[PDB]
Amino acid sequence: MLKIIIPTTMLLPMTWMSKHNMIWINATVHSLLISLISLSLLNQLGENSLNFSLTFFSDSLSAPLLVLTTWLLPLMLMASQSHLSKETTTRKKLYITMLILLQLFLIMTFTATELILFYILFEATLVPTLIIITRWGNQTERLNAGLYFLFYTLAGSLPLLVALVYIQNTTGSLNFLIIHYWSHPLSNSWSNIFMWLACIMAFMVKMPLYGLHLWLPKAHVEAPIAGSMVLAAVLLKLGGYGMMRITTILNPLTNYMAYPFLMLSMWGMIMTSSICLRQTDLKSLIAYSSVSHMALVIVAIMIQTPWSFMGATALMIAHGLTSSMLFCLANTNYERVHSRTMILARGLQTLLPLMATWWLMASLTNLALPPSINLIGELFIITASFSWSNITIILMGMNMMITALYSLYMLITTQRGKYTHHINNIKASFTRENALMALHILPLLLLTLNPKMILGPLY
């Protein structure tokens, strides 16, 4: 894994020692080359994981996420170029360094073979994200959003640290391979119940769960474009990755303990999709849609069936791409009109035609038009839940309908109608923004042709 890690680390000295003109160019070029290197990890032996070393391993679950992060870094730099132009060279380099540290931490989290190291790196991501949000946000609420994000995540995580240390003491090892191979069943005792809660709750917080999702809207709304992109695409997926990894330890109690979170996620998906219908801010609407899709992912993980896990992996990747693209599309309008109110900018299809097509494709993926990977994941999850209970179809179908409604309502309001007369600052879309949208869309559409890559280990 050092083939990827070491170059990512060298990205920092290059960025710091690069000329003021050339920071973005060098960062983008070398990040893209690193992403190209990451594509080698997609080749996964079916039976066994790629155990590169004692510290690091990759499987059919970690590989797609690593590729996603490496891909995301250059898109994040491209998106963040515009609003950081006025910033001084040192601050721009610090922002790029925060992004690079975040990528390094995420890669090590995904490839780490020990749960304690995974915890250290997974919590470590808070610092760069917190710094980004609270230093390069454009609103007074960036500080409160940072406090909420940090404290929600830490309150979830710390009991996880206690539980992991206890597991290390009892089983004797926190290496995932040994844990999987031995994996003695849990007993239905209050102590084991609370251990299950401690293990699950941190990832339940990271993956916005209904009742623990309040941090996500504030953080995504108040964060800069790059921070929103990472939070939606990758940081949420850390919870899913950990929950899929951690579920091995808690085999039997999961059936008994799943019902509260299963019900919360299933009803919350409807609740948040309905929330999206009446939201007045584009970023907030995108965030709530993210919440709903991650609720679908949570249901898939809790059910603990192979098809559900494959759907969860596919949905994680597809949603990361789609939500990042949606945030970037909203950010372009925000830069042009300097407001996140949906009503303020209208009829943008006439003014900016190609951005309208980008919006259409992003919304279609959001509403799971087949054969999109979004639909593949959602359909697999839906079938697994149908096996879990035939009555599940009602809520899932209602959620599908509400998702289509809110996605196309966003598209109609922002990109359709008569243009807002007074707004005169709309200017022809730059090649950079269209290139960012295309870089988002094309990999998602291409991944449909070969869907085994994003279908996870159980495939």
């Binding site: 004692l54 090892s173 391979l177």
Partner: protein
Amino acid sequence: DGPEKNYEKTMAILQIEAEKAELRLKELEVRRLMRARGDGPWYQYPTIDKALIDHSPKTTPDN
């Protein structure tokens, strides 16, 4: 590279980690026993040195 490389490396990694887990549990047990009993090198708390005592004839016989 061929699958045999990964197969063998996984075997080696598993052996190393399992040995470490067994050693960790053994260390925990050993420390518990030593602390409870005090019969081992660890947890040997200090006691007064017998060299300090003076055995020379005292002022009074009955000492």
